């Protein structure tokens, strides 16, 4: 039994009573939070190592409820300015295709480096490139080494959407030299591939890695395919996830909303996590609420791609589990939970013309405990409580931007930039300490970033994509 003691911190527990514990400590053992206490009232147990958190804030690790990792190598100029499908077919698919396994490994490490730096400890990777050979293995090796907690949601597409062909062909003419790609696969092939992947990797890296099935959308997946995924999630006590209504061209499947359609086939349940709820109406919300569907809101990305604004307050006010996702590494274009929290707070205040539509406490909940709920993992993660995993982060507010600070949630949401996280523990392991990354040490950092830059450039050459378009004011 390895042990760790975090001492003299202010504990923002996000526990049942939302306790905030001044000058207090956390005892960790074998990856689990085993006890907590107040220093004035109790003495911490002896431990192999002590981390002094004096003058620091301790939080549960942030949870990235829905993201796409590999695409991070496509940010920096190629990705912006485009509506969802334009982005998807002229950038994302062709760019992903051009990526070799050694490229994917770098992307994953880069993504993880930025994520951990910003306090993110759990990542729901929606993987659209798992169809390409060697990619999975390359990625999983890095996830495991790095020590992050990962849900690997293996996306599949088993159905052509014939309605949208002419639209796509027209979009492709924008970059006619980038190649029109298809990642469709037969239903049975997808089942086999995902089942294999689950059998092999689910529970690996010390319980840190999970595998879920991810039918892509209601228009790109058959009923048979979604029913399988639903059944799979139930049989294996995990979740399934689906992208739902992310553009106005998806808004309507068979004369009804995607939620309506899913309801018709008995496809809304408590183990479903839907992502992207922009094109939702009152009824869609009601249906999701009725069946206890979990939600991931990609607020920044919904803006970036010009989709719009989801009805998060409406869902939250009904006690639904809504987490925050950064979305793609190239539809954001950061991996920074704090920046996105700020954005979640502000965009909804602005649109509702209501300064109190979401409290910063609530936003912080979305990033932590509620996010865990949306992953069906709230029993294991999301709060500083005895029994739960030691996924913990230490923030230093001793900086200009976060001075003064009194109310910690307000300070974090409205002031912090994302560089104030100091130490990060995942499953009891020290992944980052005084901003030094265990899986990317400072003496190796600059060289690694140069490798990532190069590979990115090369990827874009191979895909025939324009990296740096001409200066454009309008």
Which residues lie below 8 Å from residue 69, measured CB to CB, with a gap of 6+?
Answer: 107, 108, 111, 123, 125, 127, 139, 329
Residues 102 and 138: beta-carbon distance below 8 Å: yes
Name the DSSP class of 74.
G
Handedness of CA 134, 98, 198, 388 (dihedral sign): positive
Residue 249 assigned to a binding site? no
Q: Among 252, 286, 291, 349, which residue sits at the site for its own copies (rule: CB under 8 A)?
A: 286
Q: Which is nearer to its own copies, 197 or 357 (CB)?
A: 357
Name the DSSP class of 348.
H
Task: Assess 289 for contact with its own copies (CB under 8 A).
Answer: yes
φ/ψ region of 334 (left if φ > 0, alpha if ψ in -120 to 50, else beta) reads beta
The stretch near its own copies (CB under 8 A) out of 90-98, 136-144, 348-356, 399-407 is 348-356
Residues 24 and 53: beta-carbon distance below 8 Å: no
Mark 317-356 with x for binding to Fe ion (rule: CB under 5 A) and - for no binding: ----------x-----------------------------
Euclidean distance between CA atoms 193 and 232, whole angstroms: 13
Task: Assess 354 for contact with its own copies (CB under 8 A).
Answer: yes
Task: Assess 317 for contact with its own copies (CB under 8 A).
Answer: yes
Name the DSSP class of 89.
I
State the DSSP string of 273-306.
EEE--TT--HHHHHHHHHTT-EEEE-HHHHHHTT
Q: Among 282, 406, 443, 473, which residue sits at the site for its own copies (rule: CB under 8 A)?
A: 282
Residue 327 assigned to a binding site? yes
* Closest CB 348 distance from its own copies, rounded Å: 11
Q: Which is nearer to its own copies, 80 or 291 (CB)?
A: 291
The stretch near its own copies (CB under 8 A) out of 21-29, 72-80, 279-287, 413-421 is 279-287
Q: Which is nearer to its own copies, 260 or 333 (CB)?
A: 260
Task: Assess 283 for contact with its own copies (CB under 8 A).
Answer: yes
SS3 446: helix
* Closest CB 298 distance from Fe ion, rounded Å: 6
Residue 283 touches which member of its own copies, Fe ion, none, C-beta under 5-8 Å by kind: its own copies
How many residues touch Fe ion under the rule CB under 5 A: the total is 1
Burial class (CB in 10 A: 0-12, 13-18, 19+), 392: buried
SS3 241: strand
Four-CA torsion 387, 391, 392, 393, nearest 10 degrees: -170
Task: Assess 265 for contact with its own copies (CB under 8 A).
Answer: no
Task: Assess 352 for contact with its own copies (CB under 8 A).
Answer: yes
Residue 286 touches which member of its own copies, Fe ion, none, C-beta under 5-8 Å by kind: its own copies
**Closest among 384, 373, 379 to 9, alpha carbons compared:** 384
Q: Which is nearer to its own copies, 137 or 317 (CB)?
A: 317
**Closest among 61, 100, 2, 99 to 367, alpha carbons compared:** 61
Q: Which is nearer to its own copies, 236 or 289 (CB)?
A: 289
Tally helices (H) and strands (E) across the chain: 17, 18
The stretch near its own copies (CB under 8 A) out of 94-102, 164-172, 314-322, 406-414 is 314-322
Residue 163 touches which member of its own copies, Fe ion, none, C-beta under 5-8 Å by kind: none
**Closest among 371, 271, 251 to 312, alpha carbons compared:** 371
Residue 276 assigned to a binding site? yes
Residue 68 assigned to a binding site? yes
Interface with its own copies by CB under 8 A: which residues?
282-283, 286, 289, 313, 317-319, 352, 354, 356-357
Binding site residue list: 66, 68, 276, 327
Interface with Fe ion by CB under 5 A: which residues?
327
Binding site residue list for Fe cation: 66, 68, 276, 327
């Amino acid at each position: 039994m390895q042990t760790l003691s975090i001492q003299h911190g202010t504990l923002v527990t996000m526990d049942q009573y939302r306790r905030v514990l001044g000058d207090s400590w956390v005892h960790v053992q074998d990856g689990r939070i085993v006890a907590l206490g107040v220093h004035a009232e109790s003495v911490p147990p002896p431990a192999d190592r002590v981390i002094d958190a004096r003058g620091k804030v301790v939080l549960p690790g942030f949870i990235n409820a829905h993201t796409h990792v590999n695409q991070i190598l496509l940010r920096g100029g190629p990705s912006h300015g485009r509506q969802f499908y334009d982005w998807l077919f002229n950038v994302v698919y062709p760019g992903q295709k051009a990526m070799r396994p050694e490229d994917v490994a770098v992307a994953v490490r880069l993504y993880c480096a930025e994520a951990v730096r910003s306090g993110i400890t759990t990542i729901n990777e929606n993987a659209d490139s798992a169809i390409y050979p060697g990619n999975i293995e390359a990625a999983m090796a890095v996830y495991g080494e790095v020590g992050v907690r990962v849900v690997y949601a293996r996306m599949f597409f088993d159905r052509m959407d014939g309605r949208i062909q002419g639209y796509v062909d027209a979009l492709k003419a924008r970059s006619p030299q980038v190649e029109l790609c298809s990642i469709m696969e037969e239903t049975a092939v997808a089942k086999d591939r995902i089942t294999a992947l689950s059998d092999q990797y689910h529970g690996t890296a010390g319980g840190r890695i999970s595998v879920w099935p991810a039918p892509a959308t209601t228009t790109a997946v058959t009923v048979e395919g979604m029913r399988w995924a639903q059944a799979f999630a139930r049989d294996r006590a995990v979740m399934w996830t689906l992208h739902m209504a992310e553009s106005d061209h998806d808004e309507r499947i068979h004369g009804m909303s995607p939620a309506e359609y899913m309801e018709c086939y008995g496809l809304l349940d408590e183990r479903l996590q839907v992502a992207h709820c922009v094109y939702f109406d009152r009824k869609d919300v009601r249906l999701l609420h009725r069946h206890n569907v979990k939600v991931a809101s990609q607020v920044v990305s919904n803006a970036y791609l010009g989709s719009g604004v989801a009805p998060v307050p409406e869902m939250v006010e009904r006690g639904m589990a809504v987490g925050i996702g950064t979305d793609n590494g190239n539809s954001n274009d950061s991996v920074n939970m704090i920046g996105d929290m700020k954005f979640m707070a502000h965009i909804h205040r602005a649109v509702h013309r209501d300064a109190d539509v979401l409290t910063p406490e609530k936003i912080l909940e979305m990033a932590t405990i509620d996010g865990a709920r949306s992953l069906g993992m709230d029993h294991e993660i999301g709060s500083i409580e005895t029994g739960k995993r030691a996924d913990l982060i230490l923030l230093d507010l001793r900086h200009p931007q976060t001075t003064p600070h009194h109310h910690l949630a307000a300070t974090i949401v409205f002031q912090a930039y994302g560089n104030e996280v100091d130490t990060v523990l995942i499953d009891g392991n020290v992944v980052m300490e005084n901003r030094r990354l265990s899986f990317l040490p400072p003496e190796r950092e600059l060289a690694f970033l140069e490798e990532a830059q190069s590979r990115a450039t090369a990827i874009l050459q191979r895909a025939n994509m324009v990296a740096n378009p001409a200066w454009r004011s309008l």
